[PDB]
Give the backbone structure.
Amino acid sequence: GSTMHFTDDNENDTSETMESLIDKGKLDQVVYDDQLYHLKEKVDEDKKGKVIGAIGQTFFVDGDGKRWSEEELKEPYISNNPDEIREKKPLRYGKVYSTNEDSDAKDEIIVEFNREYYRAVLIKNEKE
């Protein structure tokens, strides 16, 4: 006796956006090209091999890590109750580059954030 079965494949990515990350407090990982990458360390601009994309986005959060709404942003900063207000941490995203790997891999890339370049890794690629 024997058995016979088969399978099919389909894409399986994070299927989320940059906002979704910040909204939960995921500041150590980013989304670009429908993919999720994990920041590991900061790198020099000479470590890049080529520009591949650009996030260029900008968002803000408070001391709790909540996404500031534009309605909260239009408000005047200086006001009469300095206790009632909240902090606003800006998050400026940078262009994206490739690591100097010269291979088909493309499992790691370099995401710029706060005007500094950091090296990231494909998360969806691993099960960790």
